[PDB]
Amino acid sequence: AEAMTLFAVACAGLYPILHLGRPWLFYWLIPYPNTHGMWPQFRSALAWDVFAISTYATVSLVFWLVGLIPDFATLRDRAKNIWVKRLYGIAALGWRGSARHWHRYEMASILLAGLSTPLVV
Amino acid sequence: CTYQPRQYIAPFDRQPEGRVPGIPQYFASTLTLGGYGTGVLVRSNEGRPTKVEGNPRHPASLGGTDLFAQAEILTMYDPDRSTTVLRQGVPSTWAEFTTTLGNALTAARATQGAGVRLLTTTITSPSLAAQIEQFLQAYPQARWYQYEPINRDNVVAGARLAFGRDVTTRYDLSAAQVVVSLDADFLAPGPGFVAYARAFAERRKVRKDSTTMNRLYVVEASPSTTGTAADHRLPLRADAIAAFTGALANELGVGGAPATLSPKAEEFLRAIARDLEEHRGQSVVIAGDQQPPIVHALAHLINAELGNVGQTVFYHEPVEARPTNQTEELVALVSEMAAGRVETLIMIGGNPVYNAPGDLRFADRMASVPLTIHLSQFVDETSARATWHIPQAHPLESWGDARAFDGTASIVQPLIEPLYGGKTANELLAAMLGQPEAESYDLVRSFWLEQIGETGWQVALANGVIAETVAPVIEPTLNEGAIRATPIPQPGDGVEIVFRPDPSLFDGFYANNGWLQELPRPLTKLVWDNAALMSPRTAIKLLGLPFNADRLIGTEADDRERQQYLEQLSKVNGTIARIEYRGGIIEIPIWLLPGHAEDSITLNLGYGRTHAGRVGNNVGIDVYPIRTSDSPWFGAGARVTNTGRTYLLVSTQDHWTLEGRDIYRVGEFKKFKEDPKYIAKEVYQEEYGRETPNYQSLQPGDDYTGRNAWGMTINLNACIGCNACVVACQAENNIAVVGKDQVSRGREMHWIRIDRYFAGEDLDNPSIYMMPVNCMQCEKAPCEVVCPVAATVHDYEGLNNMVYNRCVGTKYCSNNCPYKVRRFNFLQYSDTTTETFKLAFNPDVTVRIRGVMEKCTYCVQRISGARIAAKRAAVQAGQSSYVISDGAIQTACEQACPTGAIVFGDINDSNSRVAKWKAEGHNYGLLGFLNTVPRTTYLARVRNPSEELEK
Amino acid sequence: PFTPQPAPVTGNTYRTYVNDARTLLNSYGYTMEGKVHIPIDRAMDLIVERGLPVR
Amino acid sequence: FDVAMSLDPHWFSTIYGAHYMANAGLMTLAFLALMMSRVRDAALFREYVSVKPIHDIGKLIFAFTVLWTYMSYGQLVIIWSGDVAEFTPWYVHRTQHGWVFVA
Amino acid sequence: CHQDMYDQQKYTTYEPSSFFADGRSSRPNVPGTTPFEVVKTDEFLYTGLIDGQEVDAMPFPVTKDLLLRGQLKYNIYCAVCHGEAGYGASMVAERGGIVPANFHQQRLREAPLSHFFVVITNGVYRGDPENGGYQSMYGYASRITPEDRWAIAAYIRALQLSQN
Amino acid sequence: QLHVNVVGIDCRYCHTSVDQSYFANIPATETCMTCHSQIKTYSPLLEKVRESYATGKPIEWVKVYDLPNFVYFNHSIHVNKGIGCSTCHGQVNNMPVVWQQQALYMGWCL
Numbered sequence A: 001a002e003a004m005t006l007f008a009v010a011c012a013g014l015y016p017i018l019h020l021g022r023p024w025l026f027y028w029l030i031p032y033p034n035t036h037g038m039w040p041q042f043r044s045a046l047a048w049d050v051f052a053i054s055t056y057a058t059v060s061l062v063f064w065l066v067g068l069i070p071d072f073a074t075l076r077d078r079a080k081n082i083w084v085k086r087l088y089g090i091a092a093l094g095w096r097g098s099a100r101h102w103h104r105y106e107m108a109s110i111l112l113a114g115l116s117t118p119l120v121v
Numbered sequence B: 001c002t003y004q005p006r007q008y009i010a011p012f013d014r015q016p017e018g019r020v021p022g023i024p025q026y027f028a029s030t031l032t033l034g035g036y037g038t039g040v041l042v043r044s045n046e047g048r049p050t051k052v053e054g055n056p057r058h059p060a061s062l063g064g065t066d067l068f069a070q071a072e073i074l075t076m077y078d079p080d081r082s083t084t085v086l087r088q089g090v091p092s093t094w095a096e097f098t099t100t101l102g103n104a105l106t107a108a109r110a111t112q113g114a115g116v117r118l119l120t121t122t123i124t125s126p127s128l129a130a131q132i133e134q135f136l137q138a139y140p141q142a143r144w145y146q147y148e149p150i151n152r153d154n155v156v157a158g159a160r161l162a163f164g165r166d167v168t169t170r171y172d173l174s175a176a177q178v179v180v181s182l183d184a185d186f187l188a189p190g191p192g193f194v195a196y197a198r199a200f201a202e203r204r205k206v207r208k209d210s211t212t213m214n215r216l217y218v219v220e221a222s223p224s225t226t227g228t229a230a231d232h233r234l235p236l237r238a239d240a241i242a243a244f245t246g247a248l249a250n251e252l253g254v255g256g257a258p259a260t261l262s263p264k265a266e267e268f269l270r271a272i273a274r275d276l277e278e279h280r281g282q283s284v285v286i287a288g289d290q291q292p293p294i295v296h297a298l299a300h301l302i303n304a305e306l307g308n309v310g311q312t313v314f315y316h317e318p319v320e321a322r323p324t325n326q327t328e329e330l331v332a333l334v335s336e337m338a339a340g341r342v343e344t345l346i347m348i349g350g351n352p353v354y355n356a357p358g359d360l361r362f363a364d365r366m367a368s369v370p371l372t373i374h375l376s377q378f379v380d381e382t383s384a385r386a387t388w389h390i391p392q393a394h395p396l397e398s399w400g401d402a403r404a405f406d407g408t409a410s411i412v413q414p415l416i417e418p419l420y421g422g423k424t425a426n427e428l429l430a431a432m433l434g435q436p437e438a439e440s441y442d443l444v445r446s447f448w449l450e451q452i453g454e455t456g457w458q459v460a461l462a463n464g465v466i467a468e469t470v471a472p473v474i475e476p477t478l479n480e481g482a483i484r485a486t487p488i489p490q491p492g493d494g495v496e497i498v499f500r501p502d503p504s505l506f507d508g509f510y511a512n513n514g515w516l517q518e519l520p521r522p523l524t525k526l527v528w529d530n531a532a533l534m535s536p537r538t539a540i541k542l543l544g545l546p547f548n549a550d551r552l553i554g555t556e557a558d559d560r561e562r563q564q565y566l567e568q569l570s571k572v573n574g575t576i577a578r579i580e581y582r583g584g585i586i587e588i589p590i591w592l593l594p595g596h597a598e599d600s601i602t603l604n605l606g607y608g609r610t611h612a613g614r615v616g617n618n619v620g621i622d623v624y625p626i627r628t629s630d631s632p633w634f635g636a637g638a639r640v641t642n643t644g645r646t647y648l649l650v651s652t653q654d655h656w657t658l659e660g661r662d663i664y665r666v667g668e669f670k671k672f673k674e675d676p677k678y679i680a681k682e683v684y685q686e687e688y689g690r691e692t693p694n695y696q697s698l699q700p701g702d703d704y705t706g707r708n709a710w711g712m713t714i715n716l717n718a719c720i721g722c723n724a725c726v727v728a729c730q731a732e733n734n735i736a737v738v739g740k741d742q743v744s745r746g747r748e749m750h751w752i753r754i755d756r757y758f759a760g761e762d763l764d765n766p767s768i769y770m771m772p773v774n775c776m777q778c779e780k781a782p783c784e785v786v787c788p789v790a791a792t793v794h795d796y797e798g799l800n801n802m803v804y805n806r807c808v809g810t811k812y813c814s815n816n817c818p819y820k821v822r823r824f825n826f827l828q829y830s831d832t833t834t835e836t837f838k839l840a841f842n843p844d845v846t847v848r849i850r851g852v853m854e855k856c857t858y859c860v861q862r863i864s865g866a867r868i869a870a871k872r873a874a875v876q877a878g879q880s881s882y883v884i885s886d887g888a889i890q891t892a893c894e895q896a897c898p899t900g901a902i903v904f905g906d907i908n909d910s911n912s913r914v915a916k917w918k919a920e921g922h923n924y925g926l927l928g929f930l931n932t933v934p935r936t937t938y939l940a941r942v943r944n945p946s947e948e949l950e951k
Numbered sequence C: 001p002f003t004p005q006p007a008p009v010t011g012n013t014y015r016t017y018v019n020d021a022r023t024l025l026n027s028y029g030y031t032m033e034g035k036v037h038i039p040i041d042r043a044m045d046l047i048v049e050r051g052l053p054v055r
Numbered sequence D: 001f002d003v004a005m006s007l008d009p010h011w012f013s014t015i016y017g018a019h020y021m022a023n024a025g026l027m028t029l030a031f032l033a034l035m036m037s038r039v040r041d042a043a044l045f046r047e048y049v050s051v052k053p054i055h056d057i058g059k060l061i062f063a064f065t066v067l068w069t070y071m072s073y074g075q076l077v078i079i080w081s082g083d084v085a086e087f088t089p090w091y092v093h094r095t096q097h098g099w100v101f102v103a
Numbered sequence E: 001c002h003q004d005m006y007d008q009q010k011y012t013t014y015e016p017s018s019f020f021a022d023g024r025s026s027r028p029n030v031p032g033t034t035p036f037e038v039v040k041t042d043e044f045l046y047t048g049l050i051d052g053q054e055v056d057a058m059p060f061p062v063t064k065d066l067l068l069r070g071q072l073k074y075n076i077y078c079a080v081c082h083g084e085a086g087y088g089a090s091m092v093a094e095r096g097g098i099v100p101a102n103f104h105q106q107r108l109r110e111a112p113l114s115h116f117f118v119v120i121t122n123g124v125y126r127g128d129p130e131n132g133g134y135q136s137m138y139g140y141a142s143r144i145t146p147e148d149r150w151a152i153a154a155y156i157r158a159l160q161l162s163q164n
Numbered sequence F: 001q002l003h004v005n006v007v008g009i010d011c012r013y014c015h016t017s018v019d020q021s022y023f024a025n026i027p028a029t030e031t032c033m034t035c036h037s038q039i040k041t042y043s044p045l046l047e048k049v050r051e052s053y054a055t056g057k058p059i060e061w062v063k064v065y066d067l068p069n070f071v072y073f074n075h076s077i078h079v080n081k082g083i084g085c086s087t088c089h090g091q092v093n094n095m096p097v098v099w100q101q102q103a104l105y106m107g108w109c110l
């Protein structure tokens, strides 16, 4: 389900740029240092859309990767090929699942889940 | 890579003496629509014409201009204008033509010029008339033979029946409290249109102080702009108008004939007659050019009985050179061509093969003539079949003279040397007179010098008028016996056909022009197409459409149901009907016109050209072949069978009624005199139960108390739906012309639009309402709040600012605009590959690219120029005042309007005209329930109904 | 791209002529061929006082 | 809608009623917590209870407080941003004559 | 790097044009054409000649502001290549041997005002048809407005008085 | 540098429309020839100029200060309001070859 969320957000993120009429000027909505001194309005709802979709995509990706880190550790152990290993292993970041790693992991997952529920609404 | 290309700059080698670089100049010139000159002031950005305006000192063009004069800029820059002399379609030289012409004329000197024939249009230029008279003196047997499709033959025929002499009738609408129009469009483009429109509008404009308003009664076959601005309108059949005029004379007691008529027509006759005799010397009767000569003779007789002559109607010596029956002269020429008597035919414009009636068969008879020479300014259908085609200089690039309907003798001044060369009509006449290589400037100057003098010539160029020349007032004698002893033909022979000049294309000369073809036609809103116009009842009976047509009739209680039925009655628009008139079948698609007369069809001339330029190359169906010489404006019998095969017709509005909403406010004059705010006090009682709506806003806005504030007031009573303002905006703001397919997809780009609401009881005889809509410059603007990149933000003055460079193209602003006045460049509409179109674009306004929104900018370029000029003057004086005059800034739409409905000025300055108009009791803003607080406001329409017809 | 430093102008320039003429235009003086100078803005005031022929 | 929204017939809000349900939910949850402190000793609330139910009710109260704020802010932004005369009076009445201080 | 509306299709003041033969979108003045409300009836204002002869008269009375405007115009255009004082001592004469005329010579003292107007409008003298000839003064008709040209003549009169 | 600092010619002698319109008039070949008809005639580096004024062809200068045709600058109001082409352009009096002193950014104008 979370993979579906990431891929659906990836699909839906194209439309704000595609429908834009001048699609290569999408960066204007984002605050960015420019010689003009111009700013986004921040009172329209498309400026809010830029912050909501971008925050939603990044938070979903980090939460999904944090969940995958223990799974990557099982895959690297069962990979059975030296090159297949070290690809899951770098993603695993030497997980070495242990107490004092699980305790922080469980608390972080609860906090990320708590932050995500207001975010998606 | 670098920010931009080298952008080389090329300067002059010798500076023009009177020119300051970057400062536009204005020059006075004359533009003729029917051969009658209208004075115009044209802006020359850098020696190239770019914007046509009106000449305040020219009679018939006091600031106001018609759409045809406005759209002449794009005509002068058409990429399809003739560039070289063609012998038989092969390029040639002017010198070779001069040699051939000389040889042909010396070969015709054995006879007295019996073969040499001419064929011009209505010529009013004194220089050309004098040269033609001299040529006729040199060749005794030559003939002039004027002709043009839209002519005034019936007017001169009626004059020669009533007075036994050609006179020029002028109407002073300022002193006429009652005006009656017998199938006459005086508010539609024609001779004296701007002057008549301004005088009529001034009387209609009503304030709290005003105690008197003019009343218009119009009887017509097809609803028109004159019909829209009428307190009472009767849709009589076109043939029946002559009988109606005879009945009106009989009840007044002047010579005429009693005619059987419908009860509604009889009630209209009683009201007109009763209003007359109560306004003797305060009334005028106007008869349309289309109407037969007897109607004109009766109109002169009625005016004489009421004593109106010398007060509202004035007679002058004829201003159109030699007045003549043009259709009869063309019939004489075609018979001579069939006989083979003619050996040489020279035609100055007029597109005779396409313009001439189908029965004449001019093209077949043109082949018999050994040599035919045409000066057209374009390679027209006649030029294609004519030897020795010669390019004609456009009026903007040519030296010339013209006379107005009153008689003015204004001088045409070239703003640019001819782009593709070409010869003026006077230069062609000179070569015939035996002087080749004669400059146009010398020919016109030599005639004018010694008549007005060298000093007069200098004053005439500086102003737009020649003070010395005017038509002398004459008193003609009315022949009672001749007018009384006339047939007065009775109406009724089956379905009738009415031929009317197209509102945007005229006679089809302007078919190539993109702006006019893209312009929505007033009262039908069609674009790029010609359709047969019929009443809903006429369509049901003739085409067998399955609708009752009595469902539309009803009271206010079922009004919403009847409006829905009219939408269902629509969607039958575009069905092709095969119409047989006199051996000719048109196969034209049909568009339903609610106000049209029953058993009548209107067909517009100017469509179906085959040799026109790439724009309008093959648009619409030609009506010229069915048209006949004996009955040019009327038809007796039409089969009108239905062939199905529906063809798409594109209209901009797509809705014909207001759905029970307060968009247009209409009130009586008598109630208005008692209380100006009565219209506003009402409506709010029905909607909220209280006289005043207590609108509340959560948003502060800006004070604007001590700064210039820009606002516009549009008067509904004054507007006639001419559409001149839409053309003026397109020229001034470089708006693009989208194709018919883009208009079909509803992507037309127009900053100003006029809406016809057709809202009335019955709906078979509805009251047309025309309202001009442009950005309201709302102090609190919804479009600005929804813009993510801040492309749309407000201004210190109060103007909404749309920055094309900032716009990223989201399109959210158009969705949140209540009036939907914002237009988006979905595709690259602007033309980048055409050099002539690039010259036409105004430098002050940017040419938008694809992906940017556009909206009315209150002509910001004019406001910015005035602000810079006021600041510069203040600093030089040392005052630091920065004061801008009330008349300093005029928007292009405001200058273009002939009526004067649009007023633009500071709102804060209480002495400005806009401030005084906005203090009127009937001023209001559209959609007040939305707290937008618009600056563009409207004045509610006030009518003047007669108690006879109304009560 | 550093802002260019153009080489200075030569010894002889227009400033000497303009300065000498501007000094001469006022402070009265005695011209060689004639008698007396008049400061600029004083001769202009004299020209308006006596005026010039019109038409 | 009948008891409260009908006091001023001129104004209507679609979110109204859902906001009352959130308000009712917060009031009842707060009431349940007050009662639980009073009945903490009751024998069946001694051998059959743990910190986990109390913690869950505290999380529910926090969720209801944020949910009520979201519904109230959502109504305010829609009415304030869409400045239509029909919906503007309710906010005008609640921001005038000292009502702004209560807000 | 969009380059979107950076160079638009419209023709600006001095933008070169390939449509015209001489490569200039800016066009020369059509001969015999007068701007709106600009009457050319007064001969004195546009030509110092009344009957083909000089007049030693000035079309409008001398004003202090008129003389100040004449001084400004003289300093901008006339002062270079003729001297700020009117003695012909200028840096242009040194580099080229121009030898400009001296205002304070007796001949120019008795010259009419309309003679000065003619000189500013056209030049000292067009070259002789025979044996060659070159225009020295070379004229300033297009650059300077007639009223400004008269102001310059009045300032020249003031300068001539200044050294007397 | 030669014409202004050495020869001593005013700015308005060449750029004559600077204080009256939005455009500073680039000199015509007529103004070039009023001195060089006699001064430095028969010079290979004034050949192009002499190529003009005989034929109508212009001299194609390269625009140094260029704005992207949606900016609509005006020299008239600026100059009249107490601003000169030194805090606005640079020491052009001492410029053998004119260079852009600063990039015309939106922020610079603001």
Ligand SMILES: CCCCCCCCCCCCCCCC(=O)OC[C@H](COP(=O)(O)OCCN)OC(=O)CCCCCCCCCCCCC
Residues within 6 Å of the ligand: D021, D022, D024, D025, D026
């Ligand atoms: C002011 C008073 C409060 C009024 C509240 C009104 C609104 C309440 C809405 C509640 C919707 C619940 C839908 C039913 C979900 C369901 O079927 O429950 C299943 C579960 C799992 O329990 P198990 O294993 O099946 O058996 C339990 C007994 N042994 O319980 C759950 O609630 C979790 C399922 C996921 C919740 C779905 C509802 C989310 C609503 C989101 C939309 C909110 C709109 C604002």
Ligand code: HEC
Residues within 6 Å of the ligand: F003, F004, F009, F010, F011, F013, F014, F015, F026, F027, F031, F061, F062, F063, F064, F065, F066, F085, F089, F092, F093, F098
């Ligand atoms: C008085 C010191 C000035 C100032 C401030 C400027 N000019 Fe000139 N100028 C002249 C010519 C023929 C050109 C074009 C050739 C070239 O650019 O080398 C210029 C150019 C400029 C520019 C740049 C133009 C651009 O497109 O950016 C500028 C900013 C400028 N000038 C300012 C001619 C003359 C001239 C002789 C007739 C004299 C004197 C001046 N200019 C003086 C000045």
Ligand code: HEC
Residues within 6 Å of the ligand: E081, E091, E092, E095, E096, F002, F003, F007, F009, F027, F031, F032, F033, F034, F035, F036, F039, F040, F043, F045, F046, F049
């Ligand atoms: C019109 C914009 C121009 C152009 C393109 C040039 N000048 Fe002049 N110029 C003047 C003087 C007194 C000199 C120096 C005389 C000398 O060196 O002996 C010049 C010099 C030049 C040059 C250099 C030529 C060389 O080095 O041999 C060039 C390329 C040049 N000019 C171009 C005087 C004037 C003058 C007032 C009389 C005006 C106006 C111009 N020049 C105008 C132009």
Ligand code: HEC
Residues within 6 Å of the ligand: E074, E077, E078, E079, E080, E081, E082, E098, E099, E100, E101, E116, E119, E120, E124, E136, E137, E138, E140, E152, F034, F035
């Ligand atoms: C260098 C290009 C000059 C400029 C700048 C001005 N003048 Fe000139 N002027 C110039 C020359 C080389 C001459 C003498 C020509 C000759 O054949 O000797 C002149 C002469 C005059 C005269 C005398 C005319 C006469 O017929 O005697 C006058 C009155 C005069 N110049 C006035 C004048 C004014 C008003 C100027 C500013 C607009 C001006 N000169 C500039 C060369 C140059």
Ligand code: HEC
Residues within 6 Å of the ligand: F011, F015, F018, F022, F023, F024, F025, F026, F065, F066, F067, F073, F075, F078, F079, F083, F084, F085, F086, F087, F088, F089, F104
């Ligand atoms: C404000 C900073 C100034 C001032 C006070 C002056 N110049 Fe001008 N100048 C300036 C800009 C931003 C531009 C670019 C215009 C454009 O369309 O891109 C220019 C341009 C010129 C030019 C080129 C010709 C033209 O653009 O019209 C010339 C020549 C020029 N400037 C000269 C000039 C002179 C003589 C001034 C009087 C001291 C002057 N500038 C003032 C910016 C500014």
Ligand code: SF4
Residues within 6 Å of the ligand: B774, B775, B776, B777, B778, B781, B782, B783, B784, B800, B816, B817, B818, B819, B820, B821, B822, B855, B932
């Ligand atoms: S009329 Fe439309 S585009 Fe114009 S200010 Fe109002 S909301 Fe904006």
Ligand code: SF4
Residues within 6 Å of the ligand: B728, B729, B732, B733, B751, B752, B774, B856, B857, B858, B859, B891, B892, B893, B894
């Ligand atoms: S004010 Fe200008 S931009 Fe607006 S509608 Fe009128 S002409 Fe068009």
Ligand code: SF4
Residues within 6 Å of the ligand: B718, B719, B720, B721, B722, B723, B724, B725, B726, B754, B772, B896, B897, B898, B899, B900, B901, B902
């Ligand atoms: S507002 Fe426009 S359409 Fe109406 S009368 Fe004036 S110009 Fe014609």
Ligand code: F3S
Residues within 6 Å of the ligand: B786, B787, B788, B789, B791, B792, B806, B807, B808, B809, B810, B811, B812, B813, B814, B852, B853
């Ligand atoms: S929302 Fe804004 S981005 Fe453009 S299309 Fe409208 S001005």
